[PDB]
Amino acid sequence: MKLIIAGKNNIAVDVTKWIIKTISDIELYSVCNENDHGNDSFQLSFKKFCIQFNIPIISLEDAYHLEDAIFLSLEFDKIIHPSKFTHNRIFNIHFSYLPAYKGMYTSAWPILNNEQESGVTLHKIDHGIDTGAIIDQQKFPLDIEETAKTLYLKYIKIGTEIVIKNLPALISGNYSIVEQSAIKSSYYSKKSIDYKNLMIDLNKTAHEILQQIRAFTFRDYQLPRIDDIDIFHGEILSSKSLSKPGTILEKNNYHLILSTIDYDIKLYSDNFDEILTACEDKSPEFISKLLKTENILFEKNHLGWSPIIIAAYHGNMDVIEWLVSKGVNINDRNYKGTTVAMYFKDYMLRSGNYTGLENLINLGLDLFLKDNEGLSVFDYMRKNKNIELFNFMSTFN
Amino acid sequence: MKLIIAGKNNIAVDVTKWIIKTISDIELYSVCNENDHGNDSFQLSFKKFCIQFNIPIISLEDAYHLEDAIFLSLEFDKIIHPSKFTHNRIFNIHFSYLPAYKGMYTSAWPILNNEQESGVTLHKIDHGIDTGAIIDQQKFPLDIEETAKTLYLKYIKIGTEIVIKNLPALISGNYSIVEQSAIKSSYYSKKSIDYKNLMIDLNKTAHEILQQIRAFTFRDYQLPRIDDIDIFHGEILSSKSLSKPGTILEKNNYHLILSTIDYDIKLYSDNFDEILTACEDKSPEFISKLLKTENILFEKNHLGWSPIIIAAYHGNMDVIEWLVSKGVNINDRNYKGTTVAMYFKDYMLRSGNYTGLENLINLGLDLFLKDNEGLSVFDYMRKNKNIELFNFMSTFN
Ligand SMILES: Cc1cn([C@H]2C[C@H](O)[C@@H](COP(=O)(O)OP(=O)(O)O[C@H]3O[C@H](C)[C@H](O)[C@H](N)[C@H]3O)O2)c(=O)[nH]c1=O
């Protein structure tokens, strides 16, 4: 068989990796999205990956003429018409529990509409928008403080899994379909949200305002901004101003308080930059007071730097352990795949203090992971001839 | 006690009637809505009613200065501020299951949002929009072909009941409250729907388009109009045009067929006028073919004339019985309260054929009802000196 993987991001990358590890005899090809210019971001560039792993990249046009192929769209950006192929072995992963939420912005809309869950759906491509028969789908609940970013990461992940579970069946042809019901079918278009002129409607209830805030929270693209302040989460108060919804009751460095249709809301200014800086050398105590929401402890900057990555690079041992106690991953990575252990090794090197490593190993620090270049911490130390640190790190299980 | 009834429509009228029948010693006052100019429509004018029943009509301003009073808002149109009263005995009926759907157009929005149910809520007035503590509420399911009109009539009815059930408790002061949750609180404003420039979004799924159609179906105000055709219901087909959503696939006297995001839809032109005319003298068979949806058999024109009222006035006996077999009320009334029996008596008079009456009585025709003027069929025949018909009608139980 030939297998054509058209799309982008960690879903296209991780499915392709699994195929490589698991299916030989398959002849792989890649079609990439138009805005994929080779740059890794909060997601990997699938184009860069394919070039490095020698997966031939072809045009959508070339894809039409391949016979004895399977075509699989993973967040692909161009319309695929099944009449342009000799076969009907054409599949898509859609980021919703179809028939609901066909179309665009499916990381926002379920939140805006205050859904209790969402899902991912594997289905056949037909001529229209997310309309072809369903092969498989899985659902999952939305968290109370779900954001568009957290939702999107759940899609990437569940999408990847649902594809890998179904791949053998698509390749063999031994899978079932069910036509999508008309009932409960919904669709949003490109025009349904203007991200370049985002307005929060403040003539709304506290809950509705917060749902809009959280729907529009996706740091790599934007934070919601109100009265010139970037907002990162908030809360519903018990007070109820008599003033008109939208009235600013309080504005300072820390927060905005607004009158709504029902209960006043408190909206936290974003202090993520201040948090990262604090993680360099302040105590867990200092950080717990600086933060307004514990969600900020799992945020990452444009490089993929999280609080734990800062604490590790600066050898701030108390903050590392505290963050872990709040459910932060001790083996967190930046966007190049560089791990906590890699950062903490740098601190060991620069400082000459090796005494903290044991603690971290005990907390589950993994020395054997590899970055996106396929190198471990050991490959780095060998390469840079840091042999005494290599050997000290090598004693640990 | 004094009891001030502020509002409009059959809810304000029927609550006031119950008070009159059931509570003496209460001193009643009325405050009316600004657009209530004394005219009965698909709802009674509360102003006309109060004038005829000698309920003194006062200004909202006068209402503030009444001591030892209770104030009850039933679809009232001006904002009520509890700080303007000596007491806090101030209640409202809202047409939703609060905390959801505060604000406007609550006969549309639950339909647009494809809710499975709605309700009515009795609560205290506080300073804001539909935000005060809840005294009582009842919920009910939305029908699959619910329209804004059918929904609205359910509100009028359930509202009326919930008020009558609770009145003694409000008068005594022996009732409980519960503060409205923030969670699941929603609000729509005046601006959320422009009824003077209504657009149906056709770049949507079949189901979404039909939900918008039905949400905007309220004959006294408007029918949805697409491509210059008034629409009265429709259906989802099994075909799926490849053409773009909104493409008109077929247009004739009977219907529009449109391409959507998923399944084609068939939208019925309104033929209500043609149906009423048919009921004058055509068969049940003829009418069953003329209609495109059985919903059209329960529609009424600006006078309150329904199909059964036409068949009765014209003595079309087969159509009367058939309509009854489809669940039409044999004691239907127009908007002046004039009943089927009143219309059928006219036919008896004009034609001299008395032979059908027995059948109708057997089907449950009620000769003892009174119109809005408080007259029965017998009061009319006495008045007009139609004594042989009076006496023939009088033999029936
Ligand atoms: C463009 C943009 C997106 N978002 C959020 C909401 C989106 O659901 C999420 C993903 O962005 P996105 O550009 O991938 O667009 P989406 O609209 O999510 O996905 C569509 O486009 C993809 C290329 C696929 O064809 C997919 N099948 C489509 O549904 O990020 C922002 O918060 N701000 C933004 O400015």
Ligand SMILES: Cc1cn([C@H]2C[C@H](O)[C@@H](COP(=O)(O)OP(=O)(O)O[C@H]3O[C@H](C)[C@H](O)[C@H](N)[C@H]3O)O2)c(=O)[nH]c1=O
């Ligand atoms: C996290 C952090 C990093 N840095 C430095 C370290 C890097 O030299 C530079 C870019 O960071 P980065 O996350 O993009 O680094 P990467 O290129 O992913 O990883 C390199 O740097 C690590 C420290 C390890 O040595 C690893 N073996 C290297 O491949 O910024 C800071 O100065 N302050 C910081 O707080």
Ligand SMILES: Cc1cn([C@H]2C[C@H](O)[C@@H](COP(=O)(O)OP(=O)(O)O[C@H]3O[C@H](C)[C@H](O)[C@H](N)[C@H]3O)O2)c(=O)[nH]c1=O
């Ligand atoms: C004005 C209008 C209303 N409608 C429908 C939807 C509405 O829910 C329903 C009732 O009309 P409406 O003018 O009573 O306005 P609503 O918006 O339903 O009710 C508000 O105004 C009332 C006076 C009360 O203050 C009530 N508490 C408010 O919620 O009729 C139309 O279909 N076309 C229309 O043009």
Ligand SMILES: Cc1cn([C@H]2C[C@H](O)[C@@H](COP(=O)(O)OP(=O)(O)O[C@H]3O[C@H](C)[C@H](O)[C@H](N)[C@H]3O)O2)c(=O)[nH]c1=O
């Ligand atoms: C239903 C119907 C009524 N009419 C006439 C009868 C009335 O004279 C006029 C207005 O109708 P309407 O529903 O407003 O009448 P109403 O004023 O409600 O009722 C009067 O007319 C009835 C027939 C009874 O005599 C009753 N006792 C009267 O009070 O239209 C028709 O010509 N064709 C019809 O199909």
Ligand SMILES: Nc1nc(=O)c2c([nH]1)NC[C@@H](CNc1ccc(C(=O)N[C@@H](CCC(=O)O)C(=O)O)cc1)N2C=O
């Ligand atoms: N047949 C098919 N259906 C899909 O839903 C789909 C594919 N193919 N392929 C990948 C991706 C592409 N999705 C899209 C969706 C809409 C437009 C589009 O042109 N959208 C405009 C209308 C026209 C315009 O932009 O000029 C819009 O308003 O949304 C382009 C690509 N997609 C599934 O993910």
Ligand SMILES: Nc1nc(=O)c2c([nH]1)NC[C@@H](CNc1ccc(C(=O)N[C@@H](CCC(=O)O)C(=O)O)cc1)N2C=O
């Ligand atoms: N305190 C109180 N709350 C209510 O929700 C309420 C009452 N009173 N009294 C009766 C009725 C009146 N409702 C309303 C609601 C809004 C406006 C209003 O002015 N609305 C505009 C904003 C201002 C404007 O029109 O200039 C809007 O955008 O909706 C007037 C009367 N109503 C419950 O039924």
Ligand SMILES: [Cl-]
């Ligand atoms: Cl090194």
Ligand SMILES: [Cl-]
């Ligand atoms: Cl008479």
Ligand SMILES: [K+]
């Ligand atoms: K307020």
Ligand SMILES: [K+]
């Ligand atoms: K279509």
Ligand code: NA
């Ligand atoms: Na299947």
Ligand code: NA
């Ligand atoms: Na947009």
Ligand code: NA
């Ligand atoms: Na060295």
Ligand code: NA
């Ligand atoms: Na109560």
Ligand code: NA
């Ligand atoms: Na409006």
Ligand code: NA
């Ligand atoms: Na006479």
